[PDB]
């Protein structure tokens with residue numbers, strides 16, 4: 094078995110290998126990359142996502158989210174308080190202000206220490222989940238707005254045509270902005286490109302050990318666990334590396350820098366934080382190997398998780414017994 098310790102793998106495709114996205118995903122899996130739950134892909138040196146980022150300041154962040162924490166430093170939840178709209182140029186200035194800017198630090202490890210020590214005492218503002226793309230239309234390789242759609246994959250594999258669309262999302266971050274422990278909707282893959290700015294640190298649990306994380310989360314967030322049998326679908330809970338190590342949960346960590354892709358694999362739990370002002374783009378995708386994960390994915394039916402239009406068909410076709418209850422949660 095390839096990669097039996099489930100380490101995060103890093104790949105350096107040539108320009109020739111960068112032509113066929115599906116084939117390269119299947120290659121990475123042949124080498125065991127999926128066992129980690131996360132892989133890094135460094136694009137060939139000849140490749141670029143677009144010519145410059147000089148003209149992005151007028152993009153609107155309609156609903157910036159202030160991420161307010163409750164709990165203890167290593168075990169906390171976050172809620173999102175909606176703020177007034179602001180442009181990317183306004184948000185960048187805010188991120189660079191004395192109140193919100195990255196503190197002095199020695200290296201990524203010192204910054205990670207300061208994040209875990211101090212996150213809960215501040216409420217950073219995240220411009221998350223903005224529909225759109227920063228890839229130039231002329232970029233033909235690994236352009237996240239030009240991927241094969243998950244609806245077309247389901248149709249190719251299963252023969253059933255379904256409604257729905259699949260488009261990318263932009264994330265504008267600042268120091269301490271945080272993504273909570275989650276898997277993707279319907280345990281899909283994700284791909285994330287860091288367009289510009291400061292790094293993003295990731296933590297990941299191997300898919301084969303995901304249920305270990307779930308059992309710890311039920312112990313650590315006991316009211317949330319009684320409220321919902323899949324409460325990590327709410328995307329609000331954080332658990333530090335120190336706490337994971339104390340409870341014997343297998344995980345790995347890696348820092349993504351500007352110009353790099355990350356791929357998360359089906360049922361790979363992940364969480365992380367931004368080091369400073371940055372912009373990422375991400376989208377879900379599927380392969381044939383995903384279908385069985387989609388059929389087994391947990392679902393939130395308590396009403397909190399509330400998701401896209403396109404998840405309806407995936408539930409209806411892959412999980413018909415769950416459909417009725419899940420849809421009640423969505424309505």
Ligand SMILES: O=C(O)CNC(=O)C(=O)O
Pocket residue numbers: 264271272283284285357363373375376
């Ligand atoms: O970058 C973020 O805030 C969160 N991204 C992801 O969870 C992803 O790409 O799967």
Ligand SMILES: [Mg+2]
Pocket residue numbers: 148149150151152
């Ligand atoms: Mg602009």
Ligand code: NI
Pocket residue numbers: 275276277283357363
């Ligand atoms: Ni994700």
Ligand SMILES: [Zn+2]
Pocket residue numbers: 320321322323324326327393394395396397398
């Ligand atoms: Zn729920």
